[PDB]
Design a protein around this ligand. Sequence first.
Ligand SMILES: CCC(CC)CN(C[C@@H](O)[C@H](Cc1ccccc1)NC(=O)O[C@H]1CO[C@H]2OCC[C@H]21)S(=O)(=O)c1ccc2ncsc2c1
Lengths: 99, 99
Amino acid sequence: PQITLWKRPLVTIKIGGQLKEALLDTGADDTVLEEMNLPGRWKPKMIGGIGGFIKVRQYDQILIEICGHKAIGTVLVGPTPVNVIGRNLLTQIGCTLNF
Amino acid sequence: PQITLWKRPLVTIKIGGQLKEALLDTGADDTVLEEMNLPGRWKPKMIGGIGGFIKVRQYDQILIEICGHKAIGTVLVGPTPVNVIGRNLLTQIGCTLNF
Ligand SMILES: CCC(CC)CN(C[C@@H](O)[C@H](Cc1ccccc1)NC(=O)O[C@H]1CO[C@H]2OCC[C@H]21)S(=O)(=O)c1ccc2ncsc2c1
């Protein structure tokens, strides 16, 4: 679809078999989801945002469907203010900016 | 134009008679720019993201040119690690997400 930006670009995602709402965030290199249970192994990592750095759990090679489009990639889980879909997955679903 | 997301979507902007580089950021409600000494009045504000909040100065009705597209709106100035063009201005240049 073509998404205008008068509202937040929020979409429904499926991860670990569960539906959630997430923000399509072209300013995020990485995908960061709020605290949740995910199966598989993970590794502790640090990511920095506008206000500093937080601790996250890095899950690699996770299946995630974004607005009906499948991706498989890295998902960081931690105290982000909102679920964000970053460029690592936006590229997989073929997302571009256009003006 | 069409911008892919393999790399950060950085573009040149013109603001306050200065040229700078900023991200086209669909996850940013507002526009947040590096410290610069703009003229005129301003209101204090706090904006939150990964890692917490930063304190910024809110300037209204600021003229900004983004890839030769003109806009006018609110700009927040403060110790942000990256210049971000937010939805308040992206809507004005006709920017959409597409997949
Ligand atoms: C609440 C949703 C997100 C936070 C998640 C908001 N951010 C915009 C993001 O695009 C931010 C913009 C950004 C980019 C780079 C440094 C600092 C901020 N990117 C970001 O934090 O990405 C992180 C995840 O991937 C990593 O790649 C970049 C940093 C990592 S922000 O910078 O904190 C921001 C911008 C305008 C704004 N107006 C009101 S609140 C508010 C918050």
